[PDB]
């Protein structure tokens, strides 16, 4: 399970690295969301977000990106552990 492992790193890596990584992901979600508002896609996105609850194909498609984000996130922390030497 990559989400299980990512949680383990966030809690067991230094506060410096965890605080850094989480803020990076927050800034990403903020950039991403602002872009949707800047492009005027509010309701089209809200009608895509509601579709997640009923669509099994979208449910796995989202789970795939989640996993990918998490893997890179882990890689960024693991990269910073070696840097602290």
């Amino acid at each position: 399970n990559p989400l299980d492992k990512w949680n383990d790193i966030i809690f067991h890596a230094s506060k410096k690295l965890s605080k850094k990584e989480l803020e990076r992901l927050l800034e990403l979600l903020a950039l991403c969301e602002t872009f949707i508002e800047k492009e005027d896609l509010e309701e089209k996105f809200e009608s895509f977000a509601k579709a997640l609850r009923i669509d099994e194909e979208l449910q796995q498609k989202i789970e795939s990106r989640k996993t990918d984000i998490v893997i890179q996130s882990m890689a960024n922390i693991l990269s910073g552990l070696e840097h602290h030497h």
Copy 2:
């Protein structure tokens, strides 16, 4: 102007980290996975709508634009406030 609240002490971001690393692992894992699913939904939507390139130029514009800089900081603060509300709700 919500950051000004005595609960946040002019910094909701470091108060959010404090809640994440101090509330139960159950609640923190629940919340972080919710934010990850949100970023995944958000990103997938950009790809579904085929705006990846238009987004990459918007993301690069952040480094040079002072107006976009604080506009992003504003949403970060907003996301974080709702995030702490969700954890505090779960207590």
